[PDB]
Design a protein around this nucleic acid. Structure first.
Length: 867
DNA sequence: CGGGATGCCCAG
DNA sequence: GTTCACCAGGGTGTCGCCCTGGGCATCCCG
RNA sequence: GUCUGCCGAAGACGCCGCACGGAGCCUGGGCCGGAAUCGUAGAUCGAACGCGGCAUCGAAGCCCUGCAGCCCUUCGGGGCCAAGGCGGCGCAGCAAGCCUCUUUCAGGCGGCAGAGUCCUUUAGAGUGUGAGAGACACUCUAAAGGAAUGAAAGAGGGCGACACCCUGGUGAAC
């Protein structure tokens, strides 16, 4: 019988491959029919729709051909050609929210109003005495716009003066220059990337160091006599040759562009903007990162993923259906085996079927282009932005006669009266005569400007009261400022609906930069010299958890945290998916269009509710945490230790509630605005990044809880899960004041808990905690409270505690360390550090003949128990 | 003569 | 019930740089 | 403008009043069907598979599309030509949008008479200044037309890049 099975198996594979060839030539016949049918003159239904059927049948051709050539024992019985391709969500499971006006926060009216400004004394440091270009400073912008009141009759002259500094419609000059100089845009991008790169040949290197020496620098005289392979591997010489190649190449291309500038464009601000963009480009193509291999050799890896020339992103071109029709039928004319070969004309060397699929996508993109958005405009109307990067350009003067709200945005033009030097004064408090930048008459300058009044509303008044304390001579130096530049935006007038032109300005205040610092904040082998350490645990559902730590008492002091909107994001995503499905299934189907419009409005409702989700609440709580830290802990006495998470870690469906790098960015900006020093590497003193491996999963009671022993104990005891697997077995909500345990559904991704749910098709509280809860069974007692089978704590609290206690271990061990040594040092040190704050925990309550049957949360406050 | 404009230069 | 490979439409987060001016030479026209 | 006296329903919410196409190329939409194929002899039993044929509801995308309607416009018209469906009966704070970017919360928005306040324009009149031009400064008085946001956070602009997620049109691996 066995020899019969072997010969019959060869018959099976040969017969099924014969079926594959018969179906293949069936596709080929169908493709010939439709390609000769698309040929039929005047056809515009075989266009697009059965052009899509053409790429479908050719994709099936390529897939059948590949599945037959790659696999010699091709025996297809997987039951997918008999599969109906069902969609498992229901047709109508609509579940909106019923919560409505159950309190509604108030708005305690406050009367913020900017008081007048005195002249600052000689407390200014020496490096920021002039406050010109690059002379210290912080240059912190202004997060709200403020509306200036344009004159009702002279606003056209103001618009004419502001049209010089207009930022948009400058890309078209750069694209026109690329078209006129290198023919095509892609050829321009490739040739300009080739010219911007620096060679590894030491001849041009030595030429650029010789140019550096002849320009007045005497530091690189032994660099000319250095060995060629040594100067190639020299990082300092690499930076020098990069800066001089930047100067030469940016100068050459800048001219090439300013020679091709049309008349009317102001060449000064265009020169500055284009020079900054080309400096950005030549830095980003030639910046190389020290990537080491296993043998210690440094690989010259570029930080930027794929830099291209500025103002040269690939814009979508509206291709026509006729040329993609001709290219498709011409691809069909050649032999079908080479129809899926690499295209010699493609830049990426794509497949011919792939480039025709992309061309068909463009051909149906031209009818569905810049439309269909969920209406997010800036004011709706036609605007043009810009910036005024000078004091001769524009500034904020203060009216000395007004005791409050006397800020005026003075902007210089040919028309208008002369500015008053005795009534108007700069916003720092210094007079108009100190700077001579817009004063008329004396010191050889003559300037006349109109000071249009400022409309101070809640946003700008709140920002000016929070960020600027310019009315106090002896103010902290991080609150005093000077104003040089303004990122205005001009909203153009409309005559169709009869509106009024409005100008919004965003000032950019160069704040004075004090020398505030905490020592050894970014020292690798040194703990920061401060009394307090704050450990931020950035998580997925809880955004951050803070556990501040004082080394004098060696205990946690506070446990501030927020809740996050993960489950709300899940609900919005599910309702958005259902409404998108019902809208899209009702669009390809026709004779129903009011249904399309009402589900467009339902999509807009869910878009507004998703627009409610943002990082604003997270950065608001970060600001509140930093303010609380500076109030209670005191200035220059803390350091926000953060876990060094991956910069581009990938999550699942919770991308809109990730906000992980936003916490680090917000903390860096918040500690920058407090006055703390900002190093050139992008680090601010008081925000220290330290890496956390599985050592951030060790217990405060002294348990490492390694993944190997946790996996072994969970395999031996499925009903008793350890580490963070305990939280996945319990319901998120509560029944009888407490959360029950449940049984997982055996499907991997459809994880539905069974909380003794004998009710048919009952989801109940199918959502669980997941990895959010850490249960330590070895901690049967904690903070004056007893637990029979251990205490369940938040995993983010454990991570925050480990992060806050980590730099002590880092200083005790040294620079060279592995995670095992940090783990055992944490295992020994953990028990010794105590808790003097209310630490959120859970209790194993007796449910159903078992103390592990339920979870109940209490405060567990040492301030009520220990002290 | 002089108010205002336009454009270039300041480079471990 | 999954996973991957394309093409549309929509939405997010995140990342490399640079910027966040004054002096001054010449034009320039009423 | 704004505030008060007085008047009302947009747009939503329940009810029904109605909708231009197949030659040719995809699919339901109904049938019928065995073979090339498979349940590890035969595989003719069953499973189906890509399909073949018949008739047909008729639609996906086009030829037919009128500018029914919206956008652009040099104002003549052109583009998509479908949409927006539209169009009544009862319900009249209860949508969207706006009052500033990124958000949250509270609040306001729609006809005609009355009242004050501010700004802008202007007038008479008056005061001093004014090598004196009845010019200027500016006051008094009067008239014309314009004038809802609080509260809590934010480093925001560019330029070029990535990497997720959702829904359709598909194909392949399980």
């Amino acid at each position: 019988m066995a020899k019969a099975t072997k010969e019959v198996k060869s018959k099976r594979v040969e017969a099924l491959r014969q079926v594959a060839y018969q179906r293949l030539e069936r596709l080929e016949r169908k493709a010939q029919k439709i390609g000769a049918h698309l040929r039929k003159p005047g056809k515009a239904a075989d266009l697009q729709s059965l052009h899509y059927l053409l790429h479908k049948v050719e994709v099936e051709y390529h897939d059948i051909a590949r599945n037959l050539e790659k696999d010699p024992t091709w025996t297809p019985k997987p039951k997918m050609r008999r599969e109906k391709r069902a969609i498992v969500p229901e047709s109508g499971p609509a579940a909106p929210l019923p919560t409505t006006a159950k309190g509604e926060p108030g708005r305690p009216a406050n009367r913020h109003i900017p008081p007048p400004v005195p002249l600052d004394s000689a407390r200014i440091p020496e490096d920021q005495q002039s406050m010109g270009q690059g002379s210290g400073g912080r240059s912190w912008c202004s997060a709200p716009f403020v509306e200036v009141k344009l004159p009702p009759t002279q606003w056209s002259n103001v618009r004419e003066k502001l049209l010089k500094f207009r930022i948009e419609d400058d890309a078209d000059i750069v694209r026109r220059w690329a078209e006129a100089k290198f023919g095509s845009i892609e050829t321009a991008r490739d040739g300009l990337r080739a010219s911007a790169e620096i060679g590894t040949s030491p001849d041009v290197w030595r030429s650029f160091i010789s140019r550096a020496i002849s320009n007045g620098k005497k530091d690189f005289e032994p660099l000319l006599s250095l060995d060629d392979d040594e100067l190639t591997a020299d990082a300092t010489a690499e930076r020098v040759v990069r800066r001089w190649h930047q100067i030469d190449w940016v100068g050459r291309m800048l001219d090439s562009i300013l020679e091709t500038v049309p008349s009317g464009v102001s060449k000064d601000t265009f020169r500055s903007r284009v020079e900054s963009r080309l400096k950005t480009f030549h830095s980003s193509v030639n910046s190389f990162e020290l990537k080491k291999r296993k043998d210690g050799t440094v690989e010259r890896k570029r930080k930027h993923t794929n830099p291209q020339f500025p103002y040269l992103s690939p814009s979508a071109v509206s291709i026509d259906p006729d040329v993609v029709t001709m290219e498709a039928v011409e691809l069909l004319q050649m032999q079908p085996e080479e129809r899926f070969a690499k295209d010699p004309n493609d830049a990426n060397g794509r497949m011919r079927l792939r480039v025709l699929q992309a061309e068909l996508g463009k051909a149906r993109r031209e009818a569905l282009g810049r439309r269909g958005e969920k209406a997010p405009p800036w004011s709706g109307r036609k605007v043009f932005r810009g910036t005024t990067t000078r004091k001769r350009e524009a500034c904020l003067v203060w009216d000395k006669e007004a005791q409050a709200d006397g800020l005026y945005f003075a902007l210089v033009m040919s028309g208008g009266p002369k500015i008053d030097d005795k009534r108007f004064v700069y916003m720092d408090g210094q007079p108009l005569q100190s700077d001579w930048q817009l004063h008329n008459g004396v010191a050889g300058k003559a300037k006349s400007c109109r000071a249009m009044p400022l409309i101070l509303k809640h946003d700008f008044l709140r920002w000016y009261h929070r960020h600027i304390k310019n009315h106090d001579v002896n103010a902290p130096l991080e609150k005093r400022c000077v104003h040089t530049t303004t990122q205005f935006v001009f909203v153009e007038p409309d005559e169709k609906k009869g509106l009024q032109p409005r100008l919004f300005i965003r000032p950019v205040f160069k704040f004075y930069d004090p020398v505030y610092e905490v020592p050894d904040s970014h020292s690798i082998d040194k703990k920061p010299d401060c009394r307090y350490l704050i450990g931020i645990a950035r998580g997925v559902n809880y955004p951050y958890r803070a556990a501040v730590y004082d080394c004098e008492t060696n205990s946690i002091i506070a446990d501030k945290f927020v809740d996050g909107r993960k489950a709300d994001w899940e609900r919005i995503r599910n309702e958005l998916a259902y409404h998108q499905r019902r809208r899209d299934l009702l669009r390809n189907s026709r004779a129903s269009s009011a249904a399309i419009q009402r589900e467009i409005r339902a999509i807009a409702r869910i878009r507004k509710r998703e627009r409610g989700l943002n990082k604003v609440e997270t950065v608001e709580s970060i600001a509140r945490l930093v303010d609380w830290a500076e109030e209670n802990l005191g200035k220059c006495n803390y350091c926000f230790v953060l876990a060094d998470l991956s910069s581009n870690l990938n999550l699942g469906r919770n991308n809109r509630v990730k906000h992980i790098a936003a916490i680090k960015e917000a903390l860096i900006n918040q500690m920058r605005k407090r006055g703390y020093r900002f190093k050139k590497s992008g680090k601010v003193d008081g925000v220290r990044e330290e890496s956390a491996w599985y050592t951030s999963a060790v217990a405060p009671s002294g348990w490492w809880a390694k993944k190997e022993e946790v996996d072994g104990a969970w395999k031996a005891d499925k009903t008793r899960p350890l580490a963070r697997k305990i939280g996945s077995y319990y319901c998120c909500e509560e029944i009888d004041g407490l959360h029950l345990r449940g049984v997982l559904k055996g499907l991997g991704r459809a994880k539905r808990l069974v909380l003794q749910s004998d009710d048919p098709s009952a989801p109940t509280r199918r959502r669980g905690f997941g990895s959010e809860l850490f249960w330590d069974p070895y901690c049967t007692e904690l903070c004056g409270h007893a637990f029979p089978q251990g205490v369940v704590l938040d995993a983010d609290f454990i991570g925050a505690f480990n992060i806050a206690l980590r730099p002590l271990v880092r200083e005790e061990l040294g620079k060279k360390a592995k995670a095992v040594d940090l783990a055992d040092r944490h295992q020994t040190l953990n028990p010794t550090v105590a808790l003097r704050c209310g630490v959120t925990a859970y209790e194993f309550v007796e449910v159903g003949g078992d103390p592990r049957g339920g979870l109940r949360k209490i405060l567990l406050n040492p301030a009520e128990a220990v002290i």
